[PDB]
């Protein structure tokens, strides 16, 4: 089988680990524990081809910035994540994530991924973000960012409900195989 390396990046708490773990082990972590760094293995079949995906998880917290470049060498595809409960996480895509991945992973395709899409309909999220004059990130603005940064693709998912998760990894695998 073909081996490919996937690296996920994005703001702290934006759902990276839950996405990788739902996809690699079909389980959703109950308690939020910030990542330091670690990786996973998943087998995937896409378009008839068998691929062993290595899924490299990174810490989004700025406190672990110095560790992130440990994961980037020899990456075949980048999942660049934000979450819909955090408008700031989308703003940080062009301000932080794009420049960093361009530097360390030149010419590696980027899938821009909106995580936690279930929270668009969560009344508590909507109520509290509205209290702060915000709202869940809308598809149109994710897509616009994907155009701005010339992402290989734009996808939305929920690790919690599993909606869209397989498609993120199928699309990433295609990007890695191109």
């Amino acid at each position, epitope marked *: 089988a073909i081996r490919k390396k996937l690296v996920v990046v994005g*703001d*702290g*708490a*934006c759902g990276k680990t839950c996405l990788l773990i739902v996809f690699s082990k079909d389980e959703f972590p109950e308690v*939020y524990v*910030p990542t330091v760094f670690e990786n996973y293995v998943a087998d995937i079949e896409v378009d008839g081809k068998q691929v062993e995906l290595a899924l490299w998880d990174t810490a*989004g*917290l*700025e*406190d672990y910035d110095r560790l992130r470049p440990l994961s980037y060498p020899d990456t075949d595809v980048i999942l660049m994540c934000f*979450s819909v*409960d*955090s408008p*700031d*996480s989308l703003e940080n895509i062009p301000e932080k994530w794009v420049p960093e991945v361009k530097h360390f992973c030149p010419n590696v395709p980027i899938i821009l991924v909106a995580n936690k899409k279930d*929270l668009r309909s*969560d009344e*508590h*999220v909507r*109520t*509290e973000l509205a*209290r*702060m*004059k915000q709202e869940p990130v809308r598809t149109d603005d994710g897509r616009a960012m994907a155009v701005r940064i010339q992402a290989y693709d734009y996808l939305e998912c929920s690790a919690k409900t599993k909606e869209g998760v397989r498609e993120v990894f199928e699309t990433a695998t295609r990007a890695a195989l191109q």
Partner: nanobody
Amino acid sequence: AVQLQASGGGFVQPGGSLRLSCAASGYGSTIETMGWFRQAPGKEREFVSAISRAPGPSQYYADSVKGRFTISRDNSKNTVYLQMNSLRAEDTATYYCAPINNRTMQDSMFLWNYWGQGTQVTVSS
């Protein structure tokens, strides 16, 4: 799994007063050390005040609110109050209460599975 809920916010004139309340709900280990946090558009989330196991006037206060804000416990109702006096425009923010722990002090988004209800305080001419 115990979650802290904020109430008592409103519109106030500069120099007025307001008392916020932080109530506990859900099941789990008691929260011994809790804090008040506030969030205004554009600025970073700000720690305001906290109270732990020791009663009395010595508590934890941001310099921004020292002498104007007083944090205390109801002694009967498992509720923390933030008495806010001499309010100023700079105090306008959405106020939340939460346990004091590594997750609540970390520089990252509000996780609404962990934060409860906020309460808006607007100070205005």
